[PDB]
Amino acid sequence: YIDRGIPYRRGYLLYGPPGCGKSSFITALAGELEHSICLLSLTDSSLSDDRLN
Amino acid sequence: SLAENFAEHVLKATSEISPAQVQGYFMLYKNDPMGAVHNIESLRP
Amino acid sequence: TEARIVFMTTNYIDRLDPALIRPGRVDLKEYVGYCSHWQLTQMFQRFYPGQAP
Numbered sequence: 001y002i003d004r005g006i007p008y009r010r011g012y013l014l015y016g017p018p019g020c021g022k023s024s025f026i027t028a029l030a031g032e033l034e035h036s037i038c039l040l041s042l043t044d045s046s047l048s049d050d051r052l053n
Numbered sequence: 054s055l056a057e058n059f060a061e062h063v064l065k066a067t068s069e070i071s072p073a074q075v076q077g078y079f080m081l082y083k084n085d086p087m088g089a090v091h092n093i094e095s096l097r098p
Numbered sequence: 099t100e101a102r103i104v105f106m107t108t109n110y111i112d113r114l115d116p117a118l119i120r121p122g123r124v125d126l127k128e129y130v131g132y133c134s135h136w137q138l139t140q141m142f143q144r145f146y147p148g149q150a151p
């Protein structure tokens with residue numbers, strides 16, 4: 001990513017009918033990769049553009 | 054073969070079954086594979 | 099959080115969004131309707147103990 005100037009970011013989207021295993025798979029993947037989860041709620045009251053950034 | 058039979062029976066019973074409903078159905082029959090294989094018809098909407 | 103039991107009640111089940119009640123968010127739905135013959139008999143026996151069935 002660095003050698004080509006591409007920003008070192010990535011995003012994933014999981015879509016489907018409820019109850020199919022999106023959140024459970026996200027938890028399992030976070031456990032497998034030994035990462036932590038930063039839960040962010042966009043529809044909050046104290047959240048602003050600068051605060052989101 | 055029990056797993057294959059259960060899968061075939063469930064797919065014949067209902068068309069769109071979510072994994073959460075399957076988990077709940079398995080919760081209903083704990084440590085009783087025979088009962089789970091037998092009582093497929095309860096999953097029909 | 100694990101080790102939690104949640105009880106929910108409503109009068110118009112048709113008004114609940116299906117995503118709110120799914121097998122893993124609500125593990126058992128039961129219908130509490132009007133009285134039946136056996137229910138009335140039991141209520142009469144409890145309210146007036148000693149009487150003949």
Ligand SMILES: Nc1ncnc2c1ncn2[C@@H]1O[C@H](COP(=O)(O)OP(=O)(O)OP(=O)(O)O)[C@@H](O)[C@H]1O
Nearest residue numbers: 017018019020021022023024025072073076121122
């Ligand atoms: N593929 C699966 N394997 C095992 N369990 C599953 C699977 N899919 C769903 N479940 C079960 O369904 C329940 C809830 O699943 P989950 O929260 O991932 O679903 P969702 O509808 O994607 O969630 P959300 O409402 O958070 O977006 C849990 O009990 C979970 O174990």
Ligand SMILES: [Mg+2]
Nearest residue numbers: 021022023024
């Ligand atoms: Mg989920």
